[PDB]
């Protein structure tokens, strides 16, 4: 998993659950 998502508006908003 790219936890740079949470870090990235866009990504964190579809990987909310992640981070």
Known sequence: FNWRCCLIP?????????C
Not at 10 to 18: E, L
Request: glycine share 0%; hydrophobic share 20%; aromatic share 12%.
């Open 10 to 18: 866009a990504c964190r908003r579809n990987h909310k659950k992640f």
